[PDB]
């Protein structure tokens, strides 16, 4: 015989912060011998990027 009007919240995630990483900087950074050594691993850094 009657009715009521109610408002309910519904939170849904959409995205997060976009993240980018440099492999040679994160692993060792400013080391030349490390830089020459990492190129023998193939396209791991390219795949991650």
């Amino acid at each position: 015989t009657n009715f009521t009007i109610s408002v309910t919240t519904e939170i849904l995630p959409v995205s997060m912060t976009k993240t980018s990483v440099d492999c040679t900087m994160y692993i060792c950074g400013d080391s030349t011998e490390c830089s020459n050594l990492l190129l023998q691993y193939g396209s791991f850094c390219t795949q991650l990027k």
């Binding site: 440099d22 040679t24 900087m25 400013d30």
Partner: protein, 50 residues
């Protein structure tokens, strides 16, 4: 495609600070030295050698 970073040039930190803690001049500048049969044995540690 790549990353941007500049390279360092020189490697200097603060200054030297040794000051030869141990007096090597005491054992090296002496008016009397030991003999071959009885040689004075000196142990030097916790200092800096220059």
């Amino acid at each position: 495609t790549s990353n941007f970073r500049v390279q360092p040039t020189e490697s200097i930190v603060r200054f030297p600070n040794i000051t030869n803690l141990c007096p090597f001049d005491e054992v090296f500048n002496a008016t009397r030295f030991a003999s071959v049969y009885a040689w004075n044995r000196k142990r030097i540690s916790n200092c800096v050698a220059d």
